[PDB]
Design a protein around this ligand. Structure first.
Ligand SMILES: [K+]
Ligand SMILES: [Mg+2]
Ligand SMILES: [Mg+2]
Ligand SMILES: [Mg+2]
Ligand SMILES: [Mg+2]
Ligand SMILES: [Mg+2]
Ligand SMILES: [Mg+2]
Ligand SMILES: [Mg+2]
Ligand SMILES: [Mg+2]
Ligand SMILES: [Mg+2]
Ligand SMILES: [Mg+2]
Ligand SMILES: [Mg+2]
Ligand SMILES: [Mg+2]
Ligand SMILES: [Mg+2]
Ligand SMILES: [Mg+2]
Ligand SMILES: [Mg+2]
Ligand SMILES: [Mg+2]
Ligand SMILES: [Mg+2]
Ligand SMILES: [Mg+2]
Ligand SMILES: [Mg+2]
Ligand SMILES: [Mg+2]
Ligand SMILES: [Mg+2]
Ligand SMILES: [Mg+2]
Ligand SMILES: [Mg+2]
Ligand SMILES: [Mg+2]
Ligand SMILES: [Mg+2]
Ligand SMILES: [Mg+2]
Ligand SMILES: [Mg+2]
Ligand SMILES: [Mg+2]
Ligand SMILES: [Mg+2]
Ligand SMILES: [Mg+2]
Ligand SMILES: [Mg+2]
Ligand SMILES: [Mg+2]
Ligand SMILES: [Mg+2]
Ligand SMILES: [Mg+2]
Ligand SMILES: [Mg+2]
Ligand SMILES: [Mg+2]
Ligand SMILES: [Mg+2]
Ligand SMILES: [Mg+2]
Ligand SMILES: [Mg+2]
Ligand SMILES: [Mg+2]
Ligand SMILES: [Mg+2]
Ligand SMILES: [Mg+2]
Ligand SMILES: [Mg+2]
Ligand SMILES: [Mg+2]
Ligand SMILES: [Mg+2]
Ligand SMILES: [Mg+2]
Ligand SMILES: [Mg+2]
Ligand SMILES: [Mg+2]
Ligand SMILES: [Mg+2]
Ligand SMILES: [Mg+2]
Ligand SMILES: [Mg+2]
Ligand SMILES: [Mg+2]
Ligand SMILES: [Mg+2]
Ligand SMILES: [Mg+2]
Ligand SMILES: [Mg+2]
Ligand SMILES: [Mg+2]
Ligand SMILES: [Mg+2]
Ligand SMILES: [Mg+2]
Ligand SMILES: [Mg+2]
Ligand SMILES: [Mg+2]
Ligand SMILES: [Mg+2]
Ligand SMILES: [Mg+2]
Ligand SMILES: [Mg+2]
Ligand SMILES: [Mg+2]
Ligand SMILES: [Mg+2]
Ligand SMILES: [Mg+2]
Ligand SMILES: [Mg+2]
Ligand SMILES: [Mg+2]
Ligand SMILES: [Mg+2]
Ligand SMILES: [Mg+2]
Ligand SMILES: [Mg+2]
Ligand SMILES: [Mg+2]
Ligand SMILES: [Mg+2]
Ligand SMILES: [Mg+2]
Ligand SMILES: [Mg+2]
Ligand SMILES: [Mg+2]
Ligand SMILES: [Mg+2]
Ligand SMILES: [Mg+2]
Ligand SMILES: [Mg+2]
Ligand SMILES: [Mg+2]
Ligand SMILES: [Mg+2]
Ligand SMILES: [Mg+2]
Ligand SMILES: [Mg+2]
Lengths: 386, 154
RNA sequence: UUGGCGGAAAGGCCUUGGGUGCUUGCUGGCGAAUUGCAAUGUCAUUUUGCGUGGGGAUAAAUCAUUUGUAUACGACUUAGA
RNA sequence: GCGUUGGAUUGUUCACCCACUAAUAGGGAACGUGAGCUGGGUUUAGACCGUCGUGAGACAGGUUAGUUUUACCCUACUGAU
RNA sequence: CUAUCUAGCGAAACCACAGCCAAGGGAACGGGCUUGGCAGAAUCAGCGGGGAAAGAAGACCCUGUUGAGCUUGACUCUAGU
RNA sequence: AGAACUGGUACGGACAAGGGGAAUCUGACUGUCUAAUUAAAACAUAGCAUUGCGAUGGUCAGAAAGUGAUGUUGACGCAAU
RNA sequence: GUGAACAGCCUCUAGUUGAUAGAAUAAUGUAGAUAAGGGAAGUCGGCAAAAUAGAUCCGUAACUUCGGGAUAAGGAUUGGC
RNA sequence: GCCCUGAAAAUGGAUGGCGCUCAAGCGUGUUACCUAUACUCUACCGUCAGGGUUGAUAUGAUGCCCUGACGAGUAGGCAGGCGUGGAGGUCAGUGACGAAGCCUAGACCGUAAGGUCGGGUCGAACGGCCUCUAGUGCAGAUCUUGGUGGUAGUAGCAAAUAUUCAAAUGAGAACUUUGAAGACUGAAGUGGGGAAAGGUUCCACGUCAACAGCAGUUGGACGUGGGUUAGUCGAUCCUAAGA
RNA sequence: AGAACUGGCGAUGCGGGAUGAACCGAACGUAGAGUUAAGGUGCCGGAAUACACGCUCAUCAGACACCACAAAAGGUGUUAG
RNA sequence: GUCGAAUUUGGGUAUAGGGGCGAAAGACUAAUCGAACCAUCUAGUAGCUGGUUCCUGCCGAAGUUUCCCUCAGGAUAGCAG
RNA sequence: AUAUUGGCGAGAGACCGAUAGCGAACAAGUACAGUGAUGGAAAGAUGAAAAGAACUUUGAAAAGAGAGUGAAAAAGUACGUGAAAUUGUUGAAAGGGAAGGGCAUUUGAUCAGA
């Protein structure tokens, strides 16, 4: 007989299976549509989630009850040191999809990216690309021949870039290498841009700008094996329930004589690839710029790092992207920030945000002071010093 | 005498056996198959490593619902274990066979385990007590182990 | 051997010059038999191995230890001359 | 495609009313769903009443009390090698 | 504290043969049969849809010229009086 | 029993240790039973009432007895409801 | 010793240190707990749990068989010096 | 007439499927072609029927031979055979130079029940034929007894707060001994004694195959011994309900 | 659910109706050859994408009896009267 | 729940199977109670359920008639050898 | 003259041959269960003869490997033979959600007949 009371089903069937993502770096599965009148530019960037903080800003939203008023908002800080271009991949289109014709690598590859090609780096002879770098021996004739093949073919061009983890406080020491599509015209000059940028860094300010809506692609925080109650949000069975209550009571009718794919079951929760869209960039901060955490209203010469460091991450020393809200993944995780796939004009996009203040009190507790100078000024002289 | 079927030269061979050994037959079968065909010194070193939990015995037949480990990867399995009792009995028989080979005058550097078989000895019977005043068997599954090491030749 | 074109799975298509073999385009000389009256009467290409010469290259992965962005165990993510 | 509710009384299905709501549609899946639960009802054995029966006892009549067992297998499903 | 993994120890239930579905027809609800869908070793933790799962020659109902407990001016008797 | 002082107003500092009220049905109460699904309103109870019997008796045993229980009793008693 | 106390809790004499262990810390459990705001809307049903609790002082209703109800209800205080 | 509307149900699914549109659809007509254990012919087996042939070397007249027809089958009937234990006769049968039994993707005969042979194993009896006889043939009976699996190295070995260090012993120590430490029972005990019951479990020495659901060098285990002393403590005596 | 006559199934395989006790065909010793039955001949699949005259276009077409359904009523759809 | 008397309990003792004992549940009477356990009668009877052991050959059914305390059975006739 | 599943002593069998035959071929009405009345098993076979494996060696030991006894250890007291279920090893082969089977043939292996 019928359900006897209607409720929406628990969970989203479009995010199945709730399995572990095949990699810790979430794949960009779609790049922005190419507009071949614009200049050559990356369609995405790689960074590392440092943590969240809170900001204060004046809302600009005519008709809102908080128009021209002050709003406190949560923001995520992504440490984004410049990415090193080390290669270029040419993609020809086929009745069976896109297909890489060939990849041309830079002549010199840093140990950071070379480590990515090794499970046991410390005991290897580090032969990676040693014969390939000899393709640049005298004239680079083979390299230019491969780039000419890419120009003569390869309707889609992507550069191979890798992160500089040595510039992050992470202990990993092994860079993350990803393909970023080159948008902008003239596949020939796509290839020229990649070749000219071989072994060179590209900064996040040349890819992303203030107020820009971006998407965040990351593997979510893993939670291991999870029961239905938290994995899917099903109702807790009554206290009286024999054999446990954190379950789904009826996992199926008699017919079909099978547990159906749509019934909530216990399994892995988290560590899933997610692409969340429409996160507004609140800051494109630079590492060399002291007063990173300062605004035109605060003026406290302080960086973005909270007092005591970003918990479980460290100190922000590089370029960083501050997006509004939250993004998938946990601290220290590699995240891919990509340009939006459509032109959002909704007045939530297109808003020019000006930060009034950036919280830098410690996240290791109920942080009371923005700076050690403010802490000393409040507390006066302590016994140890100050 | 009268071991299992062997196809090796008895003049270049030395045998060892143990009967009614109170060690798990299934575990001992897996342990014996782990070193069937190996050189003698390689097998002995491997057994000491198994005891030390550095390498494992792949469990190929008697392995239902046992458990998975990364030390089964060198044998192309996920299910491997460290059956210390079986390993100790097999090591006793291996050193006995090595001693018999020395007494025969065999080249200890050419010895490999050319035959090793475990079969079920008669079960030693105990009783276990069950709910509602019931009694079930609590039997052991002891093993007959036999092996012969031979000089490798061409 | 010359040059070109071909990326949809190109792995092929075209082309240059010289060398060399055959030519049934035409006219001759010699041979074939006994596989016994037929017997697929063995002529193809698919992998692999070994030996003889010649050219070329001179690593990794796993276990163990370690990390916790991971994790029931496997697995994952890290580090280590 | 999408949703189709919160409650008072009743074991109840049904019903009825209060109330919100965009709306409070009807149904199936062994009258879906008890090795998923619960056990209020029904439907063992205790007991009371009313009517019936000489009686033992009967009662789609009422009332109160009344043990809800097992998965480690195969498949399916969820995840994992 | 288990479950989990390990060393040691080590049962039981159950078991025609076994184990992917959809429809068909069929003893009118198939794991096998027909027609289709399909289909790739070996597996681990969970799970309770299914195996019309297990537990017991249904206790309800009916049948038997099968009983037994109980009752009564049933039939036939009997202690006692 | 009281007073001053004292403290992050804590102090039966752990331990130990009634929730309460307005009512209805029902059994007066304390007590008792279905050991292993029913503790109840069921049974018992004190109280009330009825019955039989003066011993060659009432009630009840025993196959029978020169046999028994009440009865080491006697109606303010025993026996049956 | 605390305390009303053979309560609970700690200790002396005496006795034992026996329950298969090691490593992890998923789900679901068993046992023990906490929880913003609401406060029975859950459910057949406040099931379970919570709340109350010792002592001293004050105060204590209906009804009553005058004996009770009664720790009714409802309040206050409590350490140390 | 065909087609369309009428024409709504529950897992996803059925002209059998694919698919088919001057059809591979519908109505109709003509041929060709495909194939049943049916029909036709032949062979072989058996059954039944009708016959021929005791005139000899001629042993199978229940034989040999000729002719025709037929052959489905539960329950059931009958017939002819196969096999087993034992019995009378016979083969002056087989056999320690290897009987019986058993094993044998080796061989032969029979439609079959079965029979025969080779090889291996083995060790003391056994078989062919004519008859006699029966406790004479198994897949089942939730059959009986015994044995053995998969499940499965699985469920599990999680109540009673709790163990740790070192040395000794030993082949071997998480578990034995000693020392050190940490704990608990907390006198209504995890203490000290007894009644019932047990019966040597007491104690010493030796000692670990089994048992102590891990282990074990330890033990209420195993092996060998030692040990229970009464005029006064009980029984014994008395009577109780009662026998 | 119950009768009549016959033929079947039970008791029966075989070819066909995909599948199916009973329908169609045909009943069965072991084989060979030929021909057929019913049913079929695009492919599955053995066998003419045969020949001939027409009808039908369905945004739910139709596609062989038993048999696995469809009606009344309608349509300048189209065809013939 | 109850916890100083219809209290709890040891030992002794009595009551024994259509019997005991029952503050009464058909309760208890050695895991046995709406009639204990043991042995024998007894291989109790069963129109009911299950099973019923080698081959081949030939023939080959009935579920209908009448009667029955008969309707899951038999006799009888029929069908069969 | 008749009876005789008891007792004592004898002779026999178309009987049974260790799941049979008495329950008991054996320390069987035993071990064991029950308070009790009662209930009540399982269990025979080295070899002619222990000749029951001296001695060496590895092992803490059990045992192993040798040596030896024996007609045989393919008879080692876990003992005649030594089936099947089930199992190990070796060898061969096959294997996309069972396996097994029928007809026919390929291939491999194997084999009788003239
Ligand atoms: K009765
Ligand atoms: Mg609904
Ligand atoms: Mg959430
Ligand atoms: Mg419950
Ligand atoms: Mg914080
Ligand atoms: Mg498994
Ligand atoms: Mg498990
Ligand atoms: Mg137990
Ligand atoms: Mg018990
Ligand atoms: Mg239902
Ligand atoms: Mg269910
Ligand atoms: Mg249930
Ligand atoms: Mg239900
Ligand atoms: Mg109820
Ligand atoms: Mg009742
Ligand atoms: Mg009346
Ligand atoms: Mg009724
Ligand atoms: Mg199906
Ligand atoms: Mg159907
Ligand atoms: Mg089935
Ligand atoms: Mg199929
Ligand atoms: Mg598979
Ligand atoms: Mg479960
Ligand atoms: Mg199920
Ligand atoms: Mg029945
Ligand atoms: Mg019954
Ligand atoms: Mg009758
Ligand atoms: Mg009667
Ligand atoms: Mg009362
Ligand atoms: Mg009282
Ligand atoms: Mg009870
Ligand atoms: Mg109760
Ligand atoms: Mg009463
Ligand atoms: Mg005091
Ligand atoms: Mg709360
Ligand atoms: Mg609160
Ligand atoms: Mg409140
Ligand atoms: Mg409510
Ligand atoms: Mg409700
Ligand atoms: Mg209610
Ligand atoms: Mg409660
Ligand atoms: Mg009060
Ligand atoms: Mg009151
Ligand atoms: Mg239609
Ligand atoms: Mg067709
Ligand atoms: Mg036609
Ligand atoms: Mg024929
Ligand atoms: Mg004749
Ligand atoms: Mg016939
Ligand atoms: Mg006989
Ligand atoms: Mg022989
Ligand atoms: Mg065989
Ligand atoms: Mg002999
Ligand atoms: Mg018989
Ligand atoms: Mg049998
Ligand atoms: Mg049978
Ligand atoms: Mg059976
Ligand atoms: Mg059995
Ligand atoms: Mg386990
Ligand atoms: Mg447990
Ligand atoms: Mg414990
Ligand atoms: Mg100690
Ligand atoms: Mg305590
Ligand atoms: Mg204590
Ligand atoms: Mg002692
Ligand atoms: Mg043990
Ligand atoms: Mg031990
Ligand atoms: Mg002793
Ligand atoms: Mg005295
Ligand atoms: Mg029939
Ligand atoms: Mg027929
Ligand atoms: Mg059909
Ligand atoms: Mg064809
Ligand atoms: Mg019409
Ligand atoms: Mg009653
Ligand atoms: Mg009988
Ligand atoms: Mg016939
Ligand atoms: Mg009559
Ligand atoms: Mg019947
Ligand atoms: Mg016997
Ligand atoms: Mg024997
Ligand atoms: Mg012999
Ligand atoms: Mg033997
Ligand atoms: Mg076998």
């Amino acid at each position: 007989s019928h359900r006897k009371y209607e409720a929406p089903r628990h969970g989203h069937l479009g995010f199945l299976p709730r399995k572990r993502a095949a990699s810790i770096r979430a794949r960009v599965k779609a790049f922005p549509k190419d507009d071949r009148s614009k200049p050559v530019a990356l369609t995405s960037f790689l960074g590392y989630k440092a943590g969240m903080t809170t900001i204060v800003r004046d809302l600009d939203r005519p008709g809102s009850k908080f128009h021209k008023r002050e709003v406190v908002e949560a923001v995520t800080v992504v440490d984004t040191p410049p990415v090193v271009v080390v290669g270029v991949v040419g993609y020809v289109e086929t009745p069976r999809g896109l297909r890489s014709l060939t990849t041309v690598w830079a002549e010199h590859l840093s140990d950071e990216v070379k480590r990515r090609f090794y499970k046991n780096w410390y005991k290897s002879k580090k032969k990676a690309f040693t014969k390939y770098s000899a393709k640049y021996a005298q004239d680079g004739a083979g390299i230019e021949r491969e780039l000419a093949r890419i120009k003569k073919y390869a309707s889609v061009v992507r550069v191979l870039v890798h992160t500089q983890i040595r510039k992050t406080p992470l202990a990993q020491k092994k860079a993350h290498l990803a393909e970023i599509q080159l948008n902008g015209g003239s596949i020939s000059e796509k290839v020229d841009w990649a070749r000219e940028h071989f072994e060179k860094t590209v900064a996040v300010d040349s890819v992303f700008e203030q107020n820009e809506m971006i998407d965040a692609i990351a593997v979510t925080k893993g939670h291991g094996f999870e029961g239905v109650t938290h994995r899917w949000g099903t109702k807790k069975l009554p206290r009286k329930t024999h054999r446990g209550l954190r379950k789904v009571a009826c996992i199926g009718a008699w017919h079909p004589a099978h547990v159906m794919w749509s019934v909530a079951r216990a399994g892995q929760r988290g560590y899933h690839s997610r692409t969340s869209i429409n996160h507004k960039i609140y800051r494109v901060g630079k590492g060399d710029d002291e007063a990173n955490g300062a605004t035109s209203f605060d003026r406290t010469k302080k960086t973005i790092t909270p007092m005591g460091g970003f918990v479980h991450y460290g100190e922000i020393k590089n370029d960083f992207i501050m997006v509004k809200g939250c993004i998938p993944g946990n601290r220290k995780r590699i995240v891919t920030l990509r340009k939006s796939l459509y032109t959002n004009t909704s007045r939530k996009a297109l808003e020019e945000v000006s930060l009034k203040w950036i919280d830098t009190a410690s996240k290791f507790g109920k942080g009371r002071f923005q700076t050690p100078a403010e802490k000393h000024a409040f507390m006066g002289t302590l016994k140890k010093d100050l | 005498a009268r071991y299992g079927a062997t196809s090796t030269n008895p003049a270049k061979s030395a045998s060892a056996r143990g009967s009614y050994l109170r060690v798990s037959f299934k575990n001992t079968r897996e342990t014996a198959q782990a070193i069937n065909g190996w050189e003698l010194t390689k097998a002995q070193k491997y057994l000491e490593q198994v005891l030390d939990h550095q390498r494992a015995i792949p469990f190929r037949r008697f392995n239902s619902s046992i458990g998975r480990t990364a030390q089964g990867k060198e044998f192309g399995v996920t299910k491997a274990r460290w059956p210390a009792k079986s390993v100790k009995f097999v090591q006793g028989l291996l050193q006995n066979a090595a001693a018999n080979a020395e007494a025969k005058g065999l080249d200890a550097t050419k010895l490999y385990v050319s035959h090793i078989q475990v079969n079920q000895a008669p079960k030693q019977r105990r009783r276990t007590y069950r709910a509602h005043g019931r009694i079930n068997k609590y039997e052991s599954s002891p093993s007959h182990i036999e092996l012969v090491v031979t000089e490798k030749e061409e």
